Amino acid sequence: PIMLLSGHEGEVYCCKFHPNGSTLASAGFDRLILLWNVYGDCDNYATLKGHSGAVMELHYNTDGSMLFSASTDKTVAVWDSETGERVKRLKGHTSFVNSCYPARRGPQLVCTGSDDGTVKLWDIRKKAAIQTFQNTYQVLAVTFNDTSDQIISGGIDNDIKVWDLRQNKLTYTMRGHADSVTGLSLSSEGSYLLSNAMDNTVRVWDVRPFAPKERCVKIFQGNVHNFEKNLLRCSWSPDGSKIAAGSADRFVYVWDTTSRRILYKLPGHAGSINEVAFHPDEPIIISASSDKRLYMGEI
Amino acid sequence: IGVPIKVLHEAEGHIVTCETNTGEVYRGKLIEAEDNMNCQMSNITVTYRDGRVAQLEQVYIRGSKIRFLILPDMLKNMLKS
Amino acid sequence: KAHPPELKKFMDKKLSLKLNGGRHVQGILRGFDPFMNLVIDECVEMATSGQQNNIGMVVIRGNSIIMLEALERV
Amino acid sequence: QKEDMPPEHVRKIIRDHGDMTNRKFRHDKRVYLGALKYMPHAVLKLLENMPMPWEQIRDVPVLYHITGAISFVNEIPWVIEPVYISQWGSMWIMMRREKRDRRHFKRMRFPPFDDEEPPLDYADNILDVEPLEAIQLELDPEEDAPVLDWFYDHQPLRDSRKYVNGSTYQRWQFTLPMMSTLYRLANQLLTDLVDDNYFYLFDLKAFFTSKALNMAIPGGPKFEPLVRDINKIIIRQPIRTEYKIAFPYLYNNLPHHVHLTWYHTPNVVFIKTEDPDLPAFYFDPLINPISHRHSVKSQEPLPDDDEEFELPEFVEPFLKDTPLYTDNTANGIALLWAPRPFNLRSGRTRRALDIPLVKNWYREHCPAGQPVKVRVSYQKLLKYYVLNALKHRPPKAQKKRYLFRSFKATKFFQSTKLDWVEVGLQVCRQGYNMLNLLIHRKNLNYLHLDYNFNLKPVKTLTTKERKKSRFGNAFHLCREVLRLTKLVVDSHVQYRLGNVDAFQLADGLQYIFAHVGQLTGMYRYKYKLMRQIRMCKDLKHLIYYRFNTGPVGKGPGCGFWAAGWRVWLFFMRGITPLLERWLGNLLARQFEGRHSK
Amino acid sequence: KFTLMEQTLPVTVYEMDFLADLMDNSELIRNVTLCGHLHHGKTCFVDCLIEQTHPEIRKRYDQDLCYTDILFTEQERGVGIKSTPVTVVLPDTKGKSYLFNIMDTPGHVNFSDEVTAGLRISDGVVLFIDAAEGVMLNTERLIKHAVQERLAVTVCINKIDRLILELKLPPTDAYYKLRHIVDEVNGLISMYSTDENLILSPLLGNVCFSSSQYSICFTLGSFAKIYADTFGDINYQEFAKRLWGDIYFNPKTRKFTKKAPTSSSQRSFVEFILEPLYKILAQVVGDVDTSLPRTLDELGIHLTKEELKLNIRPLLRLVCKKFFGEFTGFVDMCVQHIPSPKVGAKPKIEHTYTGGVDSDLGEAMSDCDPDGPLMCHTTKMYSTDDGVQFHAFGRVLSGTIHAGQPVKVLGENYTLEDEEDSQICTVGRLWISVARYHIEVNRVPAGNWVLIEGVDQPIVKTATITEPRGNEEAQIFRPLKFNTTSVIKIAVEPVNPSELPKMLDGLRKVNKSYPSLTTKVEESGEHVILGT
Amino acid sequence: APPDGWELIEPTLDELDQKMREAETEPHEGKRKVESLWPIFRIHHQKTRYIFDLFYKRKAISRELYEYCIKEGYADKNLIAKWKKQGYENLCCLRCIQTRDTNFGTNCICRVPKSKLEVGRIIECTHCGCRGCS
Amino acid sequence: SSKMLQHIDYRMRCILQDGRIFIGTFKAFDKHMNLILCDCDEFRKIKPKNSKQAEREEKRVLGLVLLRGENLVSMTVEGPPPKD
RNA sequence: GGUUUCUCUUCAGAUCGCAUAAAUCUUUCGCCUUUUACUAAAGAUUUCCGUGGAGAGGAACAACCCCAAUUUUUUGAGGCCUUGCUUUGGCAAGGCUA
Ligand SMILES: Nc1nc2c(ncn2[C@@H]2O[C@H](COP(=O)(O)OP(=O)(O)OP(=O)(O)O)[C@@H](O)[C@H]2O)c(=O)[nH]1
Numbered sequence A: 001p002i003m004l005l006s007g008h009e010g011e012v013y014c015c016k017f018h019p020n021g022s023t024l025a026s027a028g029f030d031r032l033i034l035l036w037n038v039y040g041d042c043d044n045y046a047t048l049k050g051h052s053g054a055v056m057e058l059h060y061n062t063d064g065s066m067l068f069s070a071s072t073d074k075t076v077a078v079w080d081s082e083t084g085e086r087v088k089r090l091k092g093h094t095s096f097v098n099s100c101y102p103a104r105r106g107p108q109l110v111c112t113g114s115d116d117g118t119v120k121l122w123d124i125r126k127k128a129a130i131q132t133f134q135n136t137y138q139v140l141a142v143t144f145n146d147t148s149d150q151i152i153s154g155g156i157d158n159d160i161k162v163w164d165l166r167q168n169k170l171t172y173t174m175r176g177h178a179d180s181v182t183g184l185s186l187s188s189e190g191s192y193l194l195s196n197a198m199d200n201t202v203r204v205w206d207v208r209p210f211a212p213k214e215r216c217v218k219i220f221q222g223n224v225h226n227f228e229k230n231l232l233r234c235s236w237s238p239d240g241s242k243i244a245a246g247s248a249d250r251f252v253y254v255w256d257t258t259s260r261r262i263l264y265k266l267p268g269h270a271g272s273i274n275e276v277a278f279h280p281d282e283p284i285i286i287s288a289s290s291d292k293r294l295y296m297g298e299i
Numbered sequence B: 001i002g003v004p005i006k007v008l009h010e011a012e013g014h015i016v017t018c019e020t021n022t023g024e025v026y027r028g029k030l031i032e033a034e035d036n037m038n039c040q041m042s043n044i045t046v047t048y049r050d051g052r053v054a055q056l057e058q059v060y061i062r063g064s065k066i067r068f069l070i071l072p073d074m075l076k077n078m079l080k081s
Numbered sequence C: 001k002a003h004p005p006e007l008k009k010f011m012d013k014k015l016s017l018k019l020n021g022g023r024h025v026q027g028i029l030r031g032f033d034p035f036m037n038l039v040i041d042e043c044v045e046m047a048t049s050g051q052q053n054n055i056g057m058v059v060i061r062g063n064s065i066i067m068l069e070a071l072e073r074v
Numbered sequence D: 001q002k003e004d005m006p007p008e009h010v011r012k013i014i015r016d017h018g019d020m021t022n023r024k025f026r027h028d029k030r031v032y033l034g035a036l037k038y039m040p041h042a043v044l045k046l047l048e049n050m051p052m053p054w055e056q057i058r059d060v061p062v063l064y065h066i067t068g069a070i071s072f073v074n075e076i077p078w079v080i081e082p083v084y085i086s087q088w089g090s091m092w093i094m095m096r097r098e099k100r101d102r103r104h105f106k107r108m109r110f111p112p113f114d115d116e117e118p119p120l121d122y123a124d125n126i127l128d129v130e131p132l133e134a135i136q137l138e139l140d141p142e143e144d145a146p147v148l149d150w151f152y153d154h155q156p157l158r159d160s161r162k163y164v165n166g167s168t169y170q171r172w173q174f175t176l177p178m179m180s181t182l183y184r185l186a187n188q189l190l191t192d193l194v195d196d197n198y199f200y201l202f203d204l205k206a207f208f209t210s211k212a213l214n215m216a217i218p219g220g221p222k223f224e225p226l227v228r229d230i231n232k233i234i235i236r237q238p239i240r241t242e243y244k245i246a247f248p249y250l251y252n253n254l255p256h257h258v259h260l261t262w263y264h265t266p267n268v269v270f271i272k273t274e275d276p277d278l279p280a281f282y283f284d285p286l287i288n289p290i291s292h293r294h295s296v297k298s299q300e301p302l303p304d305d306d307e308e309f310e311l312p313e314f315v316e317p318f319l320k321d322t323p324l325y326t327d328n329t330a331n332g333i334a335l336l337w338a339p340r341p342f343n344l345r346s347g348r349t350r351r352a353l354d355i356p357l358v359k360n361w362y363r364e365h366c367p368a369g370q371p372v373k374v375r376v377s378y379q380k381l382l383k384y385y386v387l388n389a390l391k392h393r394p395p396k397a398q399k400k401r402y403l404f405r406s407f408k409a410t411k412f413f414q415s416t417k418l419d420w421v422e423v424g425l426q427v428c429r430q431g432y433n434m435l436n437l438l439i440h441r442k443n444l445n446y447l448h449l450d451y452n453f454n455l456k457p458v459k460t461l462t463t464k465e466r467k468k469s470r471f472g473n474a475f476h477l478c479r480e481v482l483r484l485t486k487l488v489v490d491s492h493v494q495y496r497l498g499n500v501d502a503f504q505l506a507d508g509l510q511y512i513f514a515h516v517g518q519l520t521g522m523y524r525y526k527y528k529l530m531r532q533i534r535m536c537k538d539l540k541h542l543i544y545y546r547f548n549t550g551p552v553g554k555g556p557g558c559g560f561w562a563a564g565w566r567v568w569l570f571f572m573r574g575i576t577p578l579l580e581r582w583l584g585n586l587l588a589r590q591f592e593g594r595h596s597k
Numbered sequence E: 001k002f003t004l005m006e007q008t009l010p011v012t013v014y015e016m017d018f019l020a021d022l023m024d025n026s027e028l029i030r031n032v033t034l035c036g037h038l039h040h041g042k043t044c045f046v047d048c049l050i051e052q053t054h055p056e057i058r059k060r061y062d063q064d065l066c067y068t069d070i071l072f073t074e075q076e077r078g079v080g081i082k083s084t085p086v087t088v089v090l091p092d093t094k095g096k097s098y099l100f101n102i103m104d105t106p107g108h109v110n111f112s113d114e115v116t117a118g119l120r121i122s123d124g125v126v127l128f129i130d131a132a133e134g135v136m137l138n139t140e141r142l143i144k145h146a147v148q149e150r151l152a153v154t155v156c157i158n159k160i161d162r163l164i165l166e167l168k169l170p171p172t173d174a175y176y177k178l179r180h181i182v183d184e185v186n187g188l189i190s191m192y193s194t195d196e197n198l199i200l201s202p203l204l205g206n207v208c209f210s211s212s213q214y215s216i217c218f219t220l221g222s223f224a225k226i227y228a229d230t231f232g233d234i235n236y237q238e239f240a241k242r243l244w245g246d247i248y249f250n251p252k253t254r255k256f257t258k259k260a261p262t263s264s265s266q267r268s269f270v271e272f273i274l275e276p277l278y279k280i281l282a283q284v285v286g287d288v289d290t291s292l293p294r295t296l297d298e299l300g301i302h303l304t305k306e307e308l309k310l311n312i313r314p315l316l317r318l319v320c321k322k323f324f325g326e327f328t329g330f331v332d333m334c335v336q337h338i339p340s341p342k343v344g345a346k347p348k349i350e351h352t353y354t355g356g357v358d359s360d361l362g363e364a365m366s367d368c369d370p371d372g373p374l375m376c377h378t379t380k381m382y383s384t385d386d387g388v389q390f391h392a393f394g395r396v397l398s399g400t401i402h403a404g405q406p407v408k409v410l411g412e413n414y415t416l417e418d419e420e421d422s423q424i425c426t427v428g429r430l431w432i433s434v435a436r437y438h439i440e441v442n443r444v445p446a447g448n449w450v451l452i453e454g455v456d457q458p459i460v461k462t463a464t465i466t467e468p469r470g471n472e473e474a475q476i477f478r479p480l481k482f483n484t485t486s487v488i489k490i491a492v493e494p495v496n497p498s499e500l501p502k503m504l505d506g507l508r509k510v511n512k513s514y515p516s517l518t519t520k521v522e523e524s525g526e527h528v529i530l531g532t
Numbered sequence F: 001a002p003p004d005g006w007e008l009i010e011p012t013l014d015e016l017d018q019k020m021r022e023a024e025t026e027p028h029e030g031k032r033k034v035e036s037l038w039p040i041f042r043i044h045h046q047k048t049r050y051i052f053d054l055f056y057k058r059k060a061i062s063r064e065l066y067e068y069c070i071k072e073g074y075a076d077k078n079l080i081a082k083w084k085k086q087g088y089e090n091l092c093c094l095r096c097i098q099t100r101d102t103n104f105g106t107n108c109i110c111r112v113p114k115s116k117l118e119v120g121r122i123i124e125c126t127h128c129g130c131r132g133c134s
Numbered sequence G: 001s002s003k004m005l006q007h008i009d010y011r012m013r014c015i016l017q018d019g020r021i022f023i024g025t026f027k028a029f030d031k032h033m034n035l036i037l038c039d040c041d042e043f044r045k046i047k048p049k050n051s052k053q054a055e056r057e058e059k060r061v062l063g064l065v066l067l068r069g070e071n072l073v074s075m076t077v078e079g080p081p082p083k084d
Numbered sequence H: 001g002g003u004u005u006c007u008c009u010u011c012a013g014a015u016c017g018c019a020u021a022a023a024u025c026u027u028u029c030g031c032c033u034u035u036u037a038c039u040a041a042a043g044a045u046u047u048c049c050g051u052g053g054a055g056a057g058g059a060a061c062a063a064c065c066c067c068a069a070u071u072u073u074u075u076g077a078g079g080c081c082u083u084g085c086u087u088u089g090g091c092a093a094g095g096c097u098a
């Protein structure tokens, strides 16, 4: 039962699963945050408003009490998951706010990326930015490390950039994407980062203190992109076994992180696919695409 | 203005039971309960916490000294809040 | 704001009232205050053991006014 | 959406096709023959949008063939009902006065253009001439300011974010001073009745009682029958007919379809405001002294003082800053008892034809001292009125078909915007076009038609010639209602040509709507039309009565062509369907041939 | 189809278990005969009452719907014809809901019989007087009727908007008409009555000022409480007891004097009630677009942009609801004067119960407990929708009626010694009346009205119902003696003399349904009917 | 009447309306039925373009005067809003782009691109006689 | 501002300033802590969290339980809202 | 999300549409040559001028400093004991305080 929920009338760029496995936060160009149940009748309770632009990225904190919401209104707002209020806004970005990620296990640190070329770090209690890495080009995806000391950002510069907070200097650069790097995601062990490329070559790069210096650990082929110029982000399995990717080919791809085989090429969408999230406790896949409809597939 | 005080104001004409600061339970058809919950009612049947009984054709109940108020199930069916 | 005590109905009549601390009296309610503190004449107190002390008119502690009930019909 | 085309487009193509006798076309002839059939819809839709002469000129959207083959008027006449009745009260006053003042009322000289005098082009004259400023009767600026600025506009409040829904002109809402002003302007076409104690015996119930019992009331209508001991009687005063109508079960043996009379509305006290000073709530002279009088008052155990009482002070009366009354409150109170078009503030829009501004003076009971002629007029109106009272079922079934929608949905027809009177002149032009087309199609070089719709024979036709010269009531009826159009539209053509007057125009149009039976001839083809012929003469008589009451007398000039026009378009509403069927049939005969078998 | 009976029970403000509660209660009951002169406001007023009671019934803004009058004949005839049973629960300014059993009676002459039929089953009565007509026929005759049938009398002066928008007087002159009506009413009672002082003065609180087409109902006390709602700190009884009389109000001391302070000053009532009602009616009828938002905010009243755009009558009825709130003044005055069946039964058993007031059954009815013998008194009947069958209508005087039981029914001419005028039946069902629909119950104690199926066959006009087992000392309550006498006559004959049993049956049905109708079978075998 | 700035655009507008009178009063003896009415459509297009370009091109006639010309029908609202779209800049009229008047279901030849109309093909609108409006 | 209306309509066990643990569906919060609970139970002897010997005892049925703010002590979430 | 203007499809008027047109038959009546046309009644049945209800699709236009003596962040309800009841725990009463 793939469970097609409708109600998002615009391109749903973000559909994010609560790590407890009970609720969903979905948003896109709709500018609204729909908060859905997973049990019962899969009913959405609240809609969160206050972003005047497209909600470019929904995310949950590791507790799942704060909903980070990056939107093209040059804003990274915070929502209280319980009530649907906006708590504060992280403003200061002077171009479209593209990407945001929460520090894991740590005191709340936020990493954000925008089209002014800046990667901006946020400590929510300061109502302003602390450190800013102008790469040279626009920023499209940004993610934390589990140690909360290094930032992995993917942009259109074909280079996935790892900066260390303390040196404020570029420590690592991963080459191997031949087109704009659209979306990144670090694994739950912190050990490998799954990265998408419009050139359609999915790359897994391991971050360890001691490294082989060429982190092209596993290469998948199949995440098919085309003209729509959509930002594409990817997902890891709860136990790291599967790798899920939206594309533009009207299907969702699922590869085995280990044998790299295409375990699943899944239909259901008619448009370009924007995000596919992993159910934290069971083998369930949440798919939102340019068809603007959401699938709760179970496999 | 209180939603519970409003439900209490509505409670007139129906059965109302009052647990007091001392812990006695009185039942009767509520007439008029003000905003300060001063319940001036009639035909109250009050049982004390040890088991003793008492009844009056009328009764007054000070507000700040009310322990609890239980009404008939007529209310369970204002939900907009 | 400044609500009035609704005791004119019990007014001009006699009532048996318990005030806090096991105190029980009976007397003719002739008035009150916005704090509900009522001066009711002919106060006869019946102690828990049965002692009967008619003290005359007195006020009733409003903070400590536990509950009064009219001694007659409406 | 179909974007609009210039009015010069239509004027241009129809000027090319003024006569479909230049060889160059050679096809627009058969084209127009096909086009002919739908003229009865073009006729009804053209007439059913009268320019409303509290204005001068109206331009409208029309549905016209890309080959000019035909032209219908594509617009539905919605008006705010109080606006309607108010303008028509203004017109009553204005024409009342204009015959009151015009020493000798020259009437229109009817059909004023020769049988061979070709019709005028709007572009030729009426494109150019001035509007001959209209009937308009002046508002008192201070008291009529509510309605002063927008009253005599054509579709008054179509573009009013405050008053009507939108360009649909649907769903009006007003302000109460404007309501009192409209009440004032229409005061002459408004009954002053507040209760139903007038029509006790004169209402639907008792009149259907009378119909089925074959009973008659003094000032009431008459009808057919639905079907067709002496010693011991105690007699002091007679058991009467109106008694058998007011208590129709008792003194009436054997009741059938008998209604329940005695509805008793409390006799309402209403006192009119005359002069302003007179605060709205003041003991009028007509009311009688109260004089509260009886025995000793009584005692109560009233709360004597010296025991105790006193209030902590915030209190003031529930309205203290507010004065008791306002200056327009008298008019606002009249807005508590006015006729329905002036008792309200909000409602929905209706058509120009379903508003009987004249209904209840001929619903009035006992005018008592008229000539029997106009008395019978009133009774005839109660006759037809009780008929359409008794005869309203619900629609009982419904399809919401759209026909001009379907037409304009095609490439072949277009819309534009020209002058209503240009539409009318082109209507008569194309109509005679099609008719002479039909003739010369039937090869009748031995017959012709004028422009005023008289079929003229070139010679005394032979056996076979005059034999074939016979036409069916379809052809004749189209011809003669087209002549009704020639008459009315050419009357407005004369007023716009500036050659009689605005008020002379209105009296001449009422002359039409009262004397068509003297002008067209259709009864001869359809003898049922004489019922509407009656209604015509009846309402002419009645409005001559209520017109020629003051300084005007039995002369020419009563301008009232609301009602006659209205019932006329009722008649047309019934007939254009049937007419179209007959047209379809004749046309099929004329092209596909008579069915051989 | 002849009536308006519905089966879906529409939206209520109260609850059904609580209605059974109030029927169990036996103190908050007041059974009233709501009567008035011809077209004085009875059913339009009860329309206001039911319009308040149920959230989904409002006026239709063009004609006021008559919820109460149940007949196509009546809705077409436009006049009062039959008493109507209605059952409502109504709170006072205290908020104490009250079990009011209304008999909205006709104000017409030819139908005084149903007014008597609701009187015989009643404890209190409420006379509706038009402010603009004065004291008229049925006003007089029905007041005397309630007096000598020993009913508590209450006054409602309705249709004062007839004074404020039709007669349009000064407030002093409307108050002149007001004391005219109230003093004339009190005088007519004091003529018709014995030493019992039923003089109705609103300081005592037996008069309701109302406007039933425009949704106004209140007494001096109720207006005092609306004041003490605006400014909390004023007192109900002693402000209202200075709200009637020739007393003036001096605001340099802020104190009411019984002497006029100046030559030009206005009495307390004139400036406190007959001032602001003229104010509201005027400002709402005449000057809507200019300053009426200011007037509504100065009133604290809030209307939508949907409500402001409304017509003048929707606006005034709506604002009067907004302003007077709940129609508590009527019920305050009635509970103030109308005895509850306990304190209404002793005069009822006195004038009514033939068997004797002081006796076994007499005293069981005097105490009126739900556990005495069954004594039900049936003096009205109401047919079904098709009209084919009747339901017997009365109240309980002793005991409790339960459906499923058999009853002995005893009629007009029955006495104990004869035992020859009786019948035995089973009662079918039990209802609590509302004009268009009934709530069918199981056990009905004394102190409330009753509608019962199945015993209409041995009814002629009036009967009593007891259980067959026990209580061989009961007499039937006195039959009803009417305000008029049958002098008018009709001679009837079917076109088909063979259907004559059917026309006979029909004359029997109307002799049961119309309480003042008499049938005679004349000396030549003709059918004749004696009416009025 | 209209708002200020009227008397400067009233002369040229009434002149285009006199051209409208001539193009209404001309006969179609021996001419194509579309060649009889394409002058009418074209002069209407010229007046439309005058008022519309005064609105959006020159802004010499403000929102007020342009809206007055719109309501009173000296400006083609449909043609203005149509040139207010991409690809519909130089349109002769709206029938030339509306499918409703198309037998082969294709828009007027007045709108074929200069790359897809033959070298030297005179673009010929069947409704207005235009010479190319892409 | 959602401190009550977030779990409003949910089941919760609130311990009173006297000590009774009233578990019910929250009917409304208040500025004074004026609380109402529908389908209400109250506990006196024990609050069961997997109590094998007993878990539902010293339990009084309240149903509609309306308490003020003076007798308000502490709140916790105990129940999921009834689908009624 | 709100208002407004249009487009297209679906469905609904046992009192509605405070408006009121036309035909058909099929029964009675007369105009009184014939067919008509009618008559002027009925019964019904159709059609037309409007309408309602639901949706669908597009365009325009507003938008995203001092306080707590009856109901909780000053509340002085404090303690002990004797008796009793309880398997003990625990619980009921009064008294004394300072
Ligand atoms: N002007 C005005 N008319 C009212 C008012 N209340 C009722 N009416 C009208 O007065 C007429 C009297 O009818 P009812 O109100 O039913 O009078 P009634 O007392 O019930 O008289 P019956 O039932 O006929 O015996 C009705 O048409 C009402 O609409 C009012 O407050 N003001």
Ligand SMILES: [Mg+2]
Pocket (backbone or CB within 6 Å): E041, E042, E043, E044, E080, E104, E105, E106, E107
């Ligand atoms: Mg009535």
